[PDB]
Structure formats: structure tokens, C-alpha cells
Amino acid sequence: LAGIRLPVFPSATSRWVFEARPDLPTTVVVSGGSAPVLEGPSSVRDVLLQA
Amino acid sequence: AGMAAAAHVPHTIYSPLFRKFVEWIEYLCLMPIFPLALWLMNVYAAIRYR
Amino acid sequence: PQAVVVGVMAGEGVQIGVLLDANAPVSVMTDPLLKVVNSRLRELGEAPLEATGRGRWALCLVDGAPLRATQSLTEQDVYDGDRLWIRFIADTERRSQVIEHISTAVASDLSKRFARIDPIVAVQVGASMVATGVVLATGVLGWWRWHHNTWLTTIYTAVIGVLVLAVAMLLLMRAKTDADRRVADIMLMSAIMPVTVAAAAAPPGPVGSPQAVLGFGVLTVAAALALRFTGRRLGIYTTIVIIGALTMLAALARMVAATSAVTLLSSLLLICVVAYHAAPALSRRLASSVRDVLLQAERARSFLSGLLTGLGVMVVVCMTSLCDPHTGQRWLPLILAGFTSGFLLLRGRSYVDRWQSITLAGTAVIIAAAVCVRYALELSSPLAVSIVAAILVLLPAAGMAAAAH
């Protein structure tokens, strides 16, 4: 019900790539704190809310 | 029901225990065909009352 | 005759009028020709044409096909006032690829030339199956009303109409792309059929003229309403409105008072005969500055195509009903059908559109075949069928032979 999902797959049918381009960090804003700031990868931000 | 399943399945993640179960439905569908067809053809009675 | 004037197209779109030597071979002119277009582009202040890697400069038709480098400009079918395009064509030379193991070889090759299934197409398949499913549902419910006067047909069909229309509304508002719109249109269009029979089935007693008035009426209204708020799929909705409208007129007259069906059929035939001449005018009135003209042109083109189809459907049903192998001067409607077909067969040449011209031409052919079939089923005897078979094969053979030979 909370939407936690557990990925299990055969590594996309390929070997690992340690040097892959990391995920782009997301920008956020606040009404009073109108100046935008970035907090981190979109994939990781969901976990803090799903829990 | 098929139109909904066709649009919904491609974007969801399913557990391996379920993906392993749908595979076995095909086999459970084949196993009864020959025994049922010969019954509809009335072969068993023709042999028993030889 | 020593020279010809033609418009030559160059990079990104400049057209230049030039007077070319009519008999020198084209390969002798492409180099100095390129210099001149560059000189004019340079003075105009635009970016000149330039080469990129390996390739060659070529002179082609506006269709892109290059002219034979050794032939004279007069030797080719290029006349004064025509236009050409100067172009750079890249080199295609590269190494060949080989795969030895037939298993891996077949997989790799076969995966390139053909398209595999994807989630986008998967939805259009399901959407089409549900549309087929409900048109079958209304068929069995309609067949029941033909033997029973109870409310079941309207009660059950009404809820289907509501359910199908409800789902279509969400898809229409959520849609984002042409693929998304296709699925929505197919679903909405599928709602017209159940709603239509749902209304016509409501009036009690045996089915006939009184029910006919409700059915073709709601049908015409629904098709028009969908066309008004959607503004897409013009041709198909237009066809439903026309056949629905004329059928409602016939239904109402027969329901109120009519001396004979022949009178109504004769009235409809005459209405359709005059409508063919009005169709282009109707189509024309039914329809950054560049956008408005192209939109107007394609919208107009669409309306005439649909409008012609609606008329074609009505005449064949009426015409085949008017002719008869036993009633009076059996030959009179046969020749009248012939004269009616002759107009359509000849007039098809007046329109530039391929599908419009093809539908007009086909409309005449089908009537002749349908009339002979009617006269073969009834008044059945070896002479009747023998004559009809010979006619039907000779009919188109002579037409194609006269055009191709």
C-alpha cells in the first residue's frame, strides 16, 4: 500500500559498469525561500517519503 | 478486461513468484487437451465395451 | 531553341531564374552553375553551399531523382519554365559485414528490417477489440427487439451507452499526443451505436415506421454533436450525418403519410442526383497566415470526400430498390440506371484528388453489378444467369482495355 518496490532482474542481461554517469540532482524551491537549491537524486528522495 | 490489462501491465513491477506462476498456466492448459478430446470422441467406452 | 529558362533551387530555399544551354550535357554545367548560385548567395549575405567529406554535387528534379550525367538537357523531358534542384549527395562506400554461425546471423539480421511489438501499439489493439465487442452486443440486443416488445433492449443498451461514453470522456481530457487521441476517438465513436438503438427500441409495439423516426434522428444528432466538439475525423462523421438525415426524412414521411414506397424512393433518387453538383459548394462553405490557408485547404478536401461517400451509399440502395425484373416495363429502370451511371462514370475526371476520383468511378460500376445480381436471383433460369455472367466479366474488361491499350 505504501508503494515500496523491490527490484530483482539479471543485471539487465549485461555486465556491470562502475563509471556510469550518475543521476542528475533535482532543484527545489520555497515560497519564502524563493531562491532555488538542489537536494539530490530523484530516486533517493522518494525513499524518505515512502517510509 | 483485456484493454485495461494491456494498458496497465507494461508500466508495473511484479514479483518473481507471480511471473513464475503465469508460466505454469500454459502447461496446465495443455495437459488436459488430449484426455478430454478422446473422451468427447467416446474412445474410452468403445474400448471398455469391446 | 538553343536555350531554355528554368528555376534552380539552392541551399535552404533560394530560387534563381537561369537561362541554360539546351544541348550541352548536364555534367558540363553543374560546376559553373554552383559558382553562380554561390555568388548570388554571397552578395545576398547568406551562407554559401559547401562540400562535406566524401560525395559529389548533383543536379536533380524537384522529386530528387538525379539527371543522367551524359544526356543533353533537351534529350531529357525538361522544358522552358520547369524547375530543378542542385544538391550534394554523400558517398555510400563502406566495408562489408559477415557472420558465420547461422543462428546468430539470422537473429541479428532479422531484428533490423522488421518492427517488434511495443506498449504503444498494444493499446490500439485492445481499444479496437472493445469497439468490435460492443457493436456485436448491440447486434444481439437489436435482434431480440425484432421478436419481443419488452423494455430489455432499451434498458440494457442504455447502460452500455452510458458506460462507454463515460470512459471515452476521461481519455479525451487526459490525452496528450496523436497516439493518445486515436485511442480516445475509437472509443467515443463506439458509443454512437448503442445510444442509437437504445432510443429507437423504446416505443412499444411492433417495430416499424414509428421507431424508425427515433433511431435515425438520434443518430444524426449524435454524429453532428461529436463532429462539433471534437473537430477531428471529419470524413467519417460527415458520412453518418448525411445517410442519417435523408433516412430520417423518408422515415417521417412514410410514418405520417405516403402513397407508395416508389414515390419516396423516386424522391430520394432525384435529391441525390442534384446533390452531386452541390457537393463541392457545400464542402467549400463548410470550411502565421500560411497556417490558415493549409488548414482551410485540407479541411475542405476532407469534407468533399466524405460528402461524396454519403451520396454514393444512398443511390445504390435506392436504385437497386426501384428497378425490378417483373414490374411493368422491366427495361425502363435498367436503361435509366445506365444513364444515371454514365454521368458518374464520365464526371470523375473533373477532380484532382485520387481517392475522390476513385470513389466516383467505383460508384457507377457497383450499381451495374448490383442490378444484374438482382435480375439473376429473381426470374431465375439458365438464360438469365448465363447473360448476367457474360455481362459482368465483359463490362470491366472493355473499360480497362480501352484505357490501357
Short mmCIF file of C-alpha atoms in Angstrom, two decimals:
data_model
loop_
_atom_site.label_atom_id
_atom_site.label_comp_id
_atom_site.label_asym_id
_atom_site.label_seq_id
_atom_site.Cartn_x
_atom_site.Cartn_y
_atom_site.Cartn_z
CA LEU A 1 0.00 0.00 0.00
CA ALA A 2 2.85 2.43 0.66
CA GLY A 3 4.47 1.75 -2.73
CA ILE A 4 7.85 0.31 -1.78
CA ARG A 5 9.12 -1.79 -4.72
CA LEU A 6 11.95 -4.34 -4.66
CA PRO A 7 13.91 -4.62 -7.97
CA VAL A 8 15.28 -8.06 -8.99
CA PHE A 9 16.48 -8.65 -12.56
CA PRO A 10 19.52 -10.36 -14.16
CA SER A 11 21.62 -7.16 -14.24
CA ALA A 12 19.83 -6.14 -17.46
CA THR A 13 21.46 -9.18 -19.14
CA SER A 14 24.81 -7.36 -19.11
CA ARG A 15 27.95 -6.90 -17.05
CA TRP A 16 28.35 -4.01 -14.61
CA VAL A 17 29.57 -0.50 -15.48
CA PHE A 18 31.18 1.16 -12.45
CA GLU A 19 31.81 4.52 -14.22
CA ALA A 20 28.21 5.20 -15.39
CA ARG A 21 27.07 8.85 -15.40
CA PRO A 22 25.32 9.47 -12.04
CA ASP A 23 21.72 10.66 -11.85
CA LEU A 24 21.08 14.40 -12.22
CA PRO A 25 20.19 16.20 -8.92
CA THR A 26 16.73 17.86 -8.62
CA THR A 27 16.12 21.57 -7.90
CA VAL A 28 13.58 22.71 -5.26
CA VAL A 29 12.03 26.00 -4.10
CA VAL A 30 10.06 27.50 -1.21
CA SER A 31 7.55 30.36 -1.23
CA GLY A 32 9.52 32.48 1.24
CA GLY A 33 12.88 30.98 0.28
CA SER A 34 12.27 31.76 -3.38
CA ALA A 35 15.92 31.12 -4.31
CA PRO A 36 16.17 27.56 -5.71
CA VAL A 37 18.58 24.95 -4.34
CA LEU A 38 19.29 21.34 -5.35
CA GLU A 39 18.98 18.49 -2.84
CA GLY A 40 19.83 15.24 -4.68
CA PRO A 41 18.88 12.28 -6.90
CA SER A 42 15.17 11.81 -7.62
CA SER A 43 15.40 8.05 -6.94
CA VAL A 44 16.70 8.61 -3.39
CA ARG A 45 14.24 11.41 -2.45
CA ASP A 46 11.23 9.10 -2.86
CA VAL A 47 12.51 6.66 -0.21
CA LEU A 48 12.42 9.37 2.50
CA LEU A 49 8.70 9.93 1.74
CA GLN A 50 7.57 6.34 1.07
CA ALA A 51 8.87 5.21 4.52
CA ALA B 1 -10.71 -6.51 -19.06
CA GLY B 2 -8.08 -7.08 -21.76
CA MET B 3 -7.89 -3.40 -22.76
CA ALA B 4 -7.17 -2.46 -19.13
CA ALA B 5 -4.57 -5.24 -18.68
CA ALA B 6 -2.94 -4.26 -21.99
CA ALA B 7 -2.53 -0.61 -20.88
CA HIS B 8 -1.58 -1.29 -17.21
CA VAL B 9 0.87 -4.24 -17.31
CA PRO B 10 3.80 -2.66 -19.20
CA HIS B 11 4.45 0.08 -16.57
CA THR B 12 4.28 -2.04 -13.36
CA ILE B 13 6.78 -4.20 -11.47
CA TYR B 14 5.77 -7.73 -10.46
CA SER B 15 7.27 -10.15 -8.00
CA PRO B 16 9.16 -13.16 -9.41
CA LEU B 17 6.82 -15.56 -7.59
CA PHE B 18 3.95 -14.26 -9.76
CA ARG B 19 5.93 -14.18 -13.03
CA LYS B 20 6.90 -17.83 -12.34
CA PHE B 21 3.21 -18.69 -11.78
CA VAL B 22 1.79 -17.35 -15.09
CA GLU B 23 4.35 -19.52 -16.91
CA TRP B 24 2.83 -22.67 -15.36
CA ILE B 25 -0.68 -21.70 -16.51
CA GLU B 26 0.23 -22.53 -20.12
CA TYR B 27 1.38 -26.06 -19.17
CA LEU B 28 -1.74 -26.64 -17.04
CA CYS B 29 -3.79 -25.69 -20.11
CA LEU B 30 -2.03 -28.21 -22.44
CA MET B 31 -2.04 -31.27 -20.13
CA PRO B 32 -5.88 -31.76 -20.24
CA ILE B 33 -6.44 -31.41 -24.05
CA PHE B 34 -5.76 -34.99 -25.23
CA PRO B 35 -7.52 -36.79 -22.33
CA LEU B 36 -10.61 -34.55 -22.83
CA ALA B 37 -10.67 -34.83 -26.66
CA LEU B 38 -10.62 -38.66 -26.57
CA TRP B 39 -13.47 -38.57 -24.03
CA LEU B 40 -15.55 -36.32 -26.30
CA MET B 41 -14.75 -38.73 -29.17
CA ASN B 42 -16.10 -41.59 -26.96
CA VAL B 43 -12.92 -43.70 -27.31
CA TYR B 44 -12.82 -45.00 -23.70
CA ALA B 45 -16.32 -46.50 -23.87
CA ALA B 46 -15.59 -48.17 -27.23
CA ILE B 47 -12.57 -49.97 -25.68
CA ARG B 48 -14.22 -50.87 -22.35
CA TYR B 49 -17.22 -52.47 -24.12
CA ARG B 50 -15.08 -54.13 -26.76
CA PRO C 1 15.57 26.62 -79.22
CA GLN C 2 19.25 26.97 -78.35
CA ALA C 3 18.47 27.68 -74.67
CA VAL C 4 15.77 27.13 -72.03
CA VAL C 5 14.90 29.21 -68.95
CA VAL C 6 14.38 27.30 -65.69
CA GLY C 7 14.19 27.96 -61.95
CA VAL C 8 17.06 26.35 -60.00
CA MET C 9 16.71 25.67 -56.26
CA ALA C 10 19.71 26.04 -53.95
CA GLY C 11 20.62 25.70 -50.29
CA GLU C 12 17.93 26.19 -47.66
CA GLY C 13 15.43 27.52 -50.26
CA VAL C 14 16.52 30.33 -52.66
CA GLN C 15 15.05 30.02 -56.19
CA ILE C 16 17.08 31.53 -59.06
CA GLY C 17 15.90 32.00 -62.65
CA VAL C 18 18.55 30.96 -65.21
CA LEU C 19 18.82 30.52 -69.00
CA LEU C 20 20.61 27.20 -69.64
CA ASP C 21 22.20 25.74 -72.77
CA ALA C 22 19.63 23.31 -74.15
CA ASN C 23 22.02 20.80 -75.80
CA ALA C 24 25.26 20.56 -73.79
CA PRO C 25 25.30 17.56 -71.42
CA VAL C 26 24.24 18.26 -67.83
CA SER C 27 27.60 17.20 -66.36
CA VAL C 28 29.33 20.10 -68.16
CA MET C 29 27.09 22.69 -66.40
CA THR C 30 26.79 21.60 -62.71
CA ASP C 31 30.20 23.04 -61.69
CA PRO C 32 29.89 26.59 -63.12
CA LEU C 33 26.21 26.54 -62.13
CA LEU C 34 27.23 26.03 -58.48
CA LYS C 35 29.60 29.03 -58.69
CA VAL C 36 26.76 31.34 -59.83
CA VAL C 37 24.29 30.34 -57.09
CA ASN C 38 27.11 30.84 -54.55
CA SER C 39 27.96 34.27 -55.99
CA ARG C 40 24.33 35.38 -55.60
CA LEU C 41 24.09 33.88 -52.10
CA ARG C 42 27.38 35.60 -51.15
CA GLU C 43 26.17 39.01 -52.36
CA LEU C 44 22.82 38.42 -50.67
CA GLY C 45 24.83 37.79 -47.49
CA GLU C 46 23.65 34.20 -47.00
CA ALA C 47 25.84 31.20 -46.29
CA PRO C 48 27.20 29.58 -49.48
CA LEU C 49 26.94 25.92 -50.39
CA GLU C 50 29.85 23.76 -49.26
CA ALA C 51 31.03 20.16 -49.50
CA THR C 52 31.18 17.74 -46.56
CA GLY C 53 33.65 14.85 -46.59
CA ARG C 54 33.12 12.39 -49.43
CA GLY C 55 30.41 12.96 -52.00
CA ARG C 56 29.56 14.79 -55.20
CA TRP C 57 27.49 17.71 -56.49
CA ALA C 58 24.40 16.66 -58.45
CA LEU C 59 21.55 18.27 -60.41
CA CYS C 60 18.15 16.67 -59.70
CA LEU C 61 14.46 17.10 -60.39
CA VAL C 62 12.33 18.58 -57.62
CA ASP C 63 11.43 14.93 -56.97
CA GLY C 64 15.08 14.33 -56.00
CA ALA C 65 15.93 11.94 -58.85
CA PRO C 66 19.24 12.95 -60.49
CA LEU C 67 19.51 13.54 -64.23
CA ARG C 68 21.76 11.32 -66.36
CA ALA C 69 25.19 12.98 -66.46
CA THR C 70 25.80 12.11 -70.15
CA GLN C 71 22.49 13.24 -71.69
CA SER C 72 21.60 16.66 -73.09
CA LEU C 73 19.06 18.88 -71.35
CA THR C 74 16.88 18.64 -74.49
CA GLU C 75 17.31 14.86 -74.57
CA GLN C 76 15.55 14.74 -71.19
CA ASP C 77 11.93 15.88 -70.77
CA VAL C 78 12.83 19.29 -69.31
CA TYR C 79 11.02 22.26 -70.86
CA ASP C 80 11.27 26.03 -70.58
CA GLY C 81 9.59 27.16 -67.37
CA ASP C 82 10.38 23.99 -65.42
CA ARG C 83 12.47 23.89 -62.23
CA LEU C 84 15.46 21.90 -60.94
CA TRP C 85 17.46 21.39 -57.75
CA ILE C 86 21.25 21.42 -57.19
CA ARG C 87 22.24 19.08 -54.38
CA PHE C 88 25.14 17.38 -52.56
CA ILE C 89 24.93 13.56 -52.48
CA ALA C 90 27.19 11.73 -49.99
CA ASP C 91 29.41 8.68 -50.62
CA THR C 92 27.90 5.29 -49.64
CA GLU C 93 31.08 3.12 -49.78
CA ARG C 94 31.86 1.09 -46.61
CA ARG C 95 33.21 -2.32 -45.53
CA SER C 96 31.02 -5.43 -45.74
CA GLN C 97 29.91 -7.34 -42.62
CA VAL C 98 29.94 -11.16 -42.27
CA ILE C 99 28.58 -13.51 -39.57
CA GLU C 100 29.38 -17.25 -39.82
CA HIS C 101 27.13 -19.03 -37.33
CA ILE C 102 23.67 -19.16 -38.93
CA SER C 103 21.90 -18.98 -35.55
CA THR C 104 23.46 -15.64 -34.54
CA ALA C 105 23.45 -14.42 -38.14
CA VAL C 106 19.69 -14.86 -38.61
CA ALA C 107 18.86 -13.21 -35.27
CA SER C 108 20.95 -10.08 -35.88
CA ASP C 109 19.78 -9.56 -39.47
CA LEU C 110 16.09 -10.24 -38.83
CA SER C 111 15.95 -7.80 -35.87
CA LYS C 112 16.91 -4.83 -38.13
CA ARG C 113 14.43 -4.94 -41.03
CA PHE C 114 11.19 -5.71 -39.11
CA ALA C 115 9.45 -3.99 -36.20
CA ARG C 116 8.70 -5.76 -32.93
CA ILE C 117 5.60 -5.15 -30.80
CA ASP C 118 5.59 -2.34 -28.22
CA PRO C 119 3.31 -0.91 -25.47
CA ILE C 120 2.07 1.91 -27.77
CA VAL C 121 0.55 -0.48 -30.35
CA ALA C 122 -0.66 -2.91 -27.64
CA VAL C 123 -3.22 -0.27 -26.51
CA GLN C 124 -4.62 0.35 -30.03
CA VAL C 125 -5.22 -3.41 -30.41
CA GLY C 126 -7.19 -3.66 -27.15
CA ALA C 127 -9.11 -0.47 -27.96
CA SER C 128 -10.13 -1.92 -31.35
CA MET C 129 -11.24 -5.24 -29.78
CA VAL C 130 -13.55 -3.49 -27.27
CA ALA C 131 -15.08 -1.48 -30.14
CA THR C 132 -15.75 -4.73 -32.04
CA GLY C 133 -17.12 -6.27 -28.84
CA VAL C 134 -19.87 -3.67 -28.25
CA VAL C 135 -21.02 -3.48 -31.91
CA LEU C 136 -21.66 -7.25 -31.55
CA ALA C 137 -23.53 -6.68 -28.26
CA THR C 138 -25.97 -4.20 -29.86
CA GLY C 139 -26.49 -6.68 -32.72
CA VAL C 140 -27.85 -9.45 -30.48
CA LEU C 141 -29.87 -6.99 -28.35
CA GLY C 142 -31.36 -5.49 -31.53
CA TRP C 143 -32.27 -8.92 -32.93
CA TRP C 144 -34.23 -9.62 -29.71
CA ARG C 145 -36.33 -6.41 -30.08
CA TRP C 146 -37.42 -7.68 -33.52
CA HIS C 147 -39.31 -10.55 -31.84
CA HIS C 148 -40.12 -9.07 -28.42
CA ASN C 149 -41.53 -5.64 -27.50
CA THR C 150 -40.31 -5.68 -23.88
CA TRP C 151 -38.06 -2.93 -22.41
CA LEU C 152 -34.96 -5.20 -22.07
CA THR C 153 -33.30 -3.91 -25.27
CA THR C 154 -33.54 -0.22 -24.27
CA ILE C 155 -32.83 -0.89 -20.57
CA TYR C 156 -29.61 -2.90 -21.17
CA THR C 157 -28.38 -0.95 -24.22
CA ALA C 158 -28.82 2.40 -22.44
CA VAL C 159 -26.44 1.43 -19.61
CA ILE C 160 -23.81 0.26 -22.14
CA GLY C 161 -24.07 3.60 -23.96
CA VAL C 162 -23.57 5.44 -20.66
CA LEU C 163 -20.60 3.27 -19.61
CA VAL C 164 -18.80 3.52 -22.99
CA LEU C 165 -19.38 7.31 -23.20
CA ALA C 166 -18.15 7.77 -19.60
CA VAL C 167 -14.76 6.08 -20.21
CA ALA C 168 -14.28 7.95 -23.51
CA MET C 169 -14.62 11.31 -21.70
CA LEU C 170 -11.68 10.64 -19.32
CA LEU C 171 -9.42 9.52 -22.20
CA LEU C 172 -10.28 12.64 -24.24
CA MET C 173 -9.39 15.08 -21.44
CA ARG C 174 -6.19 13.25 -20.37
CA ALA C 175 -4.87 12.80 -23.96
CA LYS C 176 -1.53 14.38 -24.89
CA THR C 177 -0.37 13.09 -28.33
CA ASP C 178 -1.79 11.88 -31.63
CA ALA C 179 -1.41 8.27 -30.48
CA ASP C 180 -3.36 9.07 -27.31
CA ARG C 181 -6.06 10.83 -29.37
CA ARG C 182 -6.53 7.83 -31.71
CA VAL C 183 -7.47 5.58 -28.77
CA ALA C 184 -9.94 8.19 -27.47
CA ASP C 185 -11.66 8.73 -30.86
CA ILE C 186 -12.10 4.97 -31.45
CA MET C 187 -13.75 4.66 -28.01
CA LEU C 188 -16.05 7.72 -28.36
CA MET C 189 -17.17 6.76 -31.88
CA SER C 190 -18.11 3.31 -30.48
CA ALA C 191 -20.69 4.98 -28.15
CA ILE C 192 -22.88 6.23 -31.05
CA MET C 193 -24.20 2.73 -31.95
CA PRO C 194 -25.62 1.61 -28.55
CA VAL C 195 -27.18 5.03 -27.79
CA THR C 196 -28.85 4.99 -31.23
CA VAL C 197 -30.63 1.61 -30.93
CA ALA C 198 -31.34 2.34 -27.24
CA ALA C 199 -33.67 5.22 -28.23
CA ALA C 200 -35.31 3.59 -31.29
CA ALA C 201 -36.24 0.49 -29.23
CA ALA C 202 -38.21 2.45 -26.59
CA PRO C 203 -41.57 2.90 -28.41
CA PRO C 204 -43.72 -0.18 -27.72
CA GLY C 205 -45.48 -2.40 -30.22
CA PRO C 206 -44.12 -4.00 -33.37
CA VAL C 207 -41.08 -2.37 -34.94
CA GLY C 208 -41.53 -0.16 -38.00
CA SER C 209 -42.06 3.42 -39.19
CA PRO C 210 -42.73 4.91 -35.70
CA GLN C 211 -39.47 3.54 -34.24
CA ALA C 212 -37.52 4.43 -37.40
CA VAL C 213 -38.12 8.14 -36.71
CA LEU C 214 -36.39 8.00 -33.30
CA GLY C 215 -33.41 5.87 -34.43
CA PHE C 216 -32.11 7.79 -37.47
CA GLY C 217 -32.88 11.06 -35.65
CA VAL C 218 -30.71 10.48 -32.55
CA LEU C 219 -28.03 9.01 -34.85
CA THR C 220 -27.83 12.21 -36.94
CA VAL C 221 -27.78 14.36 -33.77
CA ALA C 222 -25.03 12.28 -32.08
CA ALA C 223 -22.75 12.27 -35.15
CA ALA C 224 -23.16 16.04 -35.60
CA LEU C 225 -22.53 16.76 -31.89
CA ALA C 226 -19.34 14.65 -31.85
CA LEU C 227 -18.10 16.42 -35.01
CA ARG C 228 -18.85 19.85 -33.48
CA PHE C 229 -16.96 19.42 -30.19
CA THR C 230 -14.19 17.10 -31.49
CA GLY C 231 -13.35 18.64 -34.87
CA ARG C 232 -11.41 15.54 -35.96
CA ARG C 233 -12.22 12.55 -38.19
CA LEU C 234 -14.37 14.87 -40.38
CA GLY C 235 -14.92 12.45 -43.29
CA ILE C 236 -16.42 9.53 -41.35
CA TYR C 237 -18.74 11.64 -39.14
CA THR C 238 -19.89 13.62 -42.22
CA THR C 239 -20.95 10.37 -43.93
CA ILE C 240 -23.04 9.25 -40.91
CA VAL C 241 -24.86 12.62 -40.77
CA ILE C 242 -25.90 12.54 -44.47
CA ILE C 243 -27.18 8.94 -44.55
CA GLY C 244 -28.85 9.55 -41.18
CA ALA C 245 -30.56 12.80 -42.30
CA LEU C 246 -32.05 11.50 -45.59
CA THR C 247 -33.22 8.31 -43.86
CA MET C 248 -34.99 10.41 -41.19
CA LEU C 249 -36.84 12.37 -43.91
CA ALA C 250 -38.01 9.14 -45.57
CA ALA C 251 -38.97 7.63 -42.19
CA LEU C 252 -41.06 10.67 -41.15
CA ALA C 253 -42.90 10.87 -44.50
CA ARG C 254 -43.72 7.14 -44.51
CA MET C 255 -44.85 7.39 -40.87
CA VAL C 256 -47.16 10.38 -41.50
CA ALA C 257 -48.48 9.57 -44.99
CA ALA C 258 -47.14 8.05 -48.22
CA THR C 259 -49.00 6.67 -51.23
CA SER C 260 -46.13 4.33 -52.15
CA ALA C 261 -42.51 3.48 -51.42
CA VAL C 262 -41.68 4.06 -55.10
CA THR C 263 -42.68 7.70 -54.61
CA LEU C 264 -40.31 8.11 -51.66
CA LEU C 265 -37.53 6.16 -53.43
CA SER C 266 -38.05 8.28 -56.56
CA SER C 267 -37.89 11.47 -54.45
CA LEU C 268 -34.64 10.32 -52.79
CA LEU C 269 -33.07 9.39 -56.15
CA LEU C 270 -33.84 12.86 -57.56
CA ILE C 271 -32.49 14.53 -54.39
CA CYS C 272 -29.20 12.61 -54.71
CA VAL C 273 -28.88 13.37 -58.46
CA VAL C 274 -28.99 17.13 -57.79
CA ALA C 275 -26.78 16.82 -54.65
CA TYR C 276 -23.72 15.69 -56.68
CA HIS C 277 -23.49 19.14 -58.31
CA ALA C 278 -23.94 20.89 -54.93
CA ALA C 279 -21.31 18.79 -53.07
CA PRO C 280 -18.24 20.96 -53.95
CA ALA C 281 -20.11 24.14 -52.97
CA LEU C 282 -21.32 22.60 -49.70
CA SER C 283 -17.77 21.41 -48.99
CA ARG C 284 -16.36 24.88 -49.71
CA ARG C 285 -18.81 26.70 -47.42
CA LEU C 286 -18.39 24.07 -44.68
CA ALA C 287 -14.74 25.08 -44.25
CA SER C 288 1.30 32.68 -39.45
CA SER C 289 -1.06 33.40 -42.35
CA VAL C 290 0.21 30.25 -44.12
CA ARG C 291 -1.27 28.02 -41.40
CA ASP C 292 -4.83 29.23 -42.05
CA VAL C 293 -4.61 28.52 -45.82
CA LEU C 294 -3.20 24.97 -45.48
CA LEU C 295 -5.65 24.19 -42.65
CA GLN C 296 -8.52 25.53 -44.79
CA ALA C 297 -7.36 23.52 -47.83
CA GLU C 298 -7.07 20.14 -46.05
CA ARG C 299 -10.33 20.68 -44.11
CA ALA C 300 -12.15 21.43 -47.40
CA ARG C 301 -10.56 18.41 -49.13
CA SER C 302 -11.82 16.20 -46.27
CA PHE C 303 -15.46 17.38 -46.44
CA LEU C 304 -15.90 16.73 -50.19
CA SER C 305 -14.54 13.15 -49.83
CA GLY C 306 -16.96 12.30 -47.00
CA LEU C 307 -19.85 14.14 -48.67
CA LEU C 308 -19.44 12.14 -51.91
CA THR C 309 -19.35 8.82 -49.98
CA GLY C 310 -22.68 9.58 -48.25
CA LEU C 311 -24.38 10.26 -51.61
CA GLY C 312 -22.87 7.12 -53.19
CA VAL C 313 -24.32 4.91 -50.44
CA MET C 314 -27.86 6.33 -50.87
CA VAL C 315 -28.17 6.00 -54.69
CA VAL C 316 -27.15 2.30 -54.83
CA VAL C 317 -29.69 1.33 -52.13
CA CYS C 318 -32.48 3.38 -53.80
CA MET C 319 -31.57 2.48 -57.42
CA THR C 320 -31.49 -1.29 -56.73
CA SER C 321 -34.85 -0.99 -54.93
CA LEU C 322 -36.51 0.94 -57.80
CA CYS C 323 -35.54 -1.49 -60.60
CA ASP C 324 -37.50 -4.76 -60.84
CA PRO C 325 -37.48 -7.87 -63.09
CA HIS C 326 -41.29 -8.39 -63.03
CA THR C 327 -42.92 -4.97 -62.58
CA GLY C 328 -44.15 -3.42 -65.84
CA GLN C 329 -41.61 -2.03 -68.32
CA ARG C 330 -38.76 -4.12 -66.89
CA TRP C 331 -36.33 -2.47 -69.37
CA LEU C 332 -37.14 1.14 -68.33
CA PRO C 333 -35.30 1.18 -64.95
CA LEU C 334 -32.45 -0.89 -66.46
CA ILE C 335 -31.67 1.78 -69.10
CA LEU C 336 -32.40 4.60 -66.59
CA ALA C 337 -29.80 3.06 -64.25
CA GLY C 338 -27.42 3.03 -67.23
CA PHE C 339 -27.90 6.75 -67.99
CA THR C 340 -27.54 7.54 -64.26
CA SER C 341 -24.25 5.56 -64.13
CA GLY C 342 -22.91 7.26 -67.30
CA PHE C 343 -22.91 10.70 -65.62
CA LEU C 344 -20.88 9.44 -62.63
CA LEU C 345 -18.55 7.37 -64.86
CA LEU C 346 -17.67 10.43 -67.02
CA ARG C 347 -17.73 13.23 -64.37
CA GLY C 348 -14.99 11.56 -62.24
CA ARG C 349 -12.28 13.29 -64.35
CA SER C 350 -13.17 16.79 -63.02
CA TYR C 351 -11.45 16.24 -59.60
CA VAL C 352 -7.70 16.14 -58.88
CA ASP C 353 -7.86 14.01 -55.70
CA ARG C 354 -7.01 10.32 -56.18
CA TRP C 355 -9.48 8.91 -53.61
CA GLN C 356 -12.28 11.29 -54.66
CA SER C 357 -11.88 10.30 -58.33
CA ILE C 358 -11.65 6.58 -57.41
CA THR C 359 -14.79 6.63 -55.22
CA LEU C 360 -16.77 8.37 -58.00
CA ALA C 361 -15.60 5.86 -60.64
CA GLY C 362 -16.36 2.90 -58.36
CA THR C 363 -19.86 4.23 -57.56
CA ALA C 364 -21.02 3.66 -61.17
CA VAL C 365 -19.50 0.14 -61.52
CA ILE C 366 -21.14 -1.26 -58.35
CA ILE C 367 -24.67 -0.22 -59.43
CA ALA C 368 -24.49 -2.10 -62.76
CA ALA C 369 -23.22 -5.26 -60.99
CA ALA C 370 -25.88 -4.98 -58.24
CA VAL C 371 -28.73 -4.61 -60.79
CA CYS C 372 -27.61 -7.71 -62.72
CA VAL C 373 -27.37 -9.71 -59.46
CA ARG C 374 -30.96 -8.72 -58.61
CA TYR C 375 -32.12 -9.84 -62.10
CA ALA C 376 -30.20 -13.14 -61.70
CA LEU C 377 -31.58 -14.16 -58.30
CA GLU C 378 -35.20 -13.47 -59.27
CA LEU C 379 -36.63 -14.55 -62.64
CA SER C 380 -34.15 -17.43 -62.33
CA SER C 381 -33.50 -19.57 -65.41
CA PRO C 382 -30.43 -20.65 -67.44
CA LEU C 383 -30.76 -17.71 -69.85
CA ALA C 384 -30.88 -15.09 -67.06
CA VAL C 385 -27.70 -16.25 -65.25
CA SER C 386 -25.83 -17.01 -68.50
CA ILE C 387 -26.42 -13.44 -69.72
CA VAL C 388 -25.57 -11.84 -66.34
CA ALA C 389 -22.29 -13.78 -66.02
CA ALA C 390 -21.09 -12.79 -69.51
CA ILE C 391 -22.05 -9.13 -68.92
CA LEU C 392 -20.24 -8.88 -65.57
CA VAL C 393 -16.88 -10.13 -66.93
CA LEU C 394 -17.01 -8.24 -70.27
CA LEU C 395 -18.07 -4.96 -68.56
CA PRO C 396 -14.77 -4.07 -66.79
CA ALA C 397 -12.51 -5.85 -69.31
CA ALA C 398 -13.61 -3.46 -72.09
CA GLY C 399 -13.15 -0.43 -69.81
CA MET C 400 -9.58 -1.24 -68.74
CA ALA C 401 -8.58 -2.36 -72.26
CA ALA C 402 -9.80 0.93 -73.76
CA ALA C 403 -7.77 2.89 -71.18
CA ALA C 404 -4.53 0.85 -71.18
CA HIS C 405 -4.34 -0.02 -74.90
#
